[PDB]
Amino acid sequence: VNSFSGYLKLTDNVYIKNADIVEEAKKVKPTVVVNAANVYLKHGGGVAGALNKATNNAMQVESDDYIATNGPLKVGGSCVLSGHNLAKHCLHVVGPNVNKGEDIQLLKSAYENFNQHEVLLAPLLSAGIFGADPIHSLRVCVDTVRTNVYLAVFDKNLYDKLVSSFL
Ligand SMILES: C=C(CCO)c1ncnc2[nH]c(C)cc12
């Protein structure tokens, strides 16, 4: 039993809700919140900009030190950093950005990072400003993630389409 509330169950291990991931993280304080990161951990917009804003820019400060030490992530890769006031940990995961020409096949590799964590609060990878089809992202999530994932979908209209079209 966990503290996630109001989710629709899609499969044995995948759950979904129309919610603002920032507000959901602040309420649940999950062990792991997933950020829709880029390789530079520049949290300017989309989910990343919103999560970083909610940390009063502390996520960005920590991220800049991480990059200065380690260099950029790989597309499809991840790193674990602090969750600040939102979660114990933040798993920064880089899905391919279609608006940069990156290979959508890397979306499966991106979701594989979730399997290193027993339970996660997450957005749909590569959705939103990353330019992928969210219906496809949900399919890859369900077919790749084996651990317990609670998906927050900000847009109510998109949430309803994802549920109604889910096979
Ligand atoms: C990709 C999106 C935008 C939906 O079109 C998203 N997904 C999950 N949580 C979110 N929180 C905010 C503030 C945007 C957001």
Curated annotation (Swiss-Prot):
Source lineage: Viruses, Riboviria, Orthornavirae, Pisuviricota, Pisoniviricetes
Lipid bilayer topology: Multi-pass membrane protein
Positions of the Macro domain: 1-167
Self-association state and partner proteins as the record states: May form homohexamers. Interacts with N protein.
Superkingdom classification of source: Viruses
Name of the protein described by the UniProt record: Papain-like protease nsp3
Cellular localisation: Host endoplasmic reticulum membrane
Organism from which the protein derives: Severe acute respiratory syndrome coronavirus 2
Activity regulation details: Inhibited in vitro by GRL-0617.
UniProt function note: Responsible for the cleavages located at the N-terminus of the replicase polyprotein. Participates together with nsp4 in the assembly of virally-induced cytoplasmic double-membrane vesicles necessary for viral replication. Antagonizes innate immune induction of type I interferon by blocking the phosphorylation, dimerization and subsequent nuclear translocation of host IRF3. Also prevents host NF-kappa-B signaling. In addition, PL-PRO possesses a deubiquitinating/deISGylating activity and processes both 'Lys-48'- and 'Lys-63'-linked polyubiquitin chains from cellular substrates.
Coiled coil residues, start to end: none
Catalytically driven reaction(s): Thiol-dependent hydrolysis of ester, thioester, amide, peptide and isopeptide bonds formed by the C-terminal Gly of ubiquitin (a 76-residue protein attached to proteins as an intracellular targeting signal)
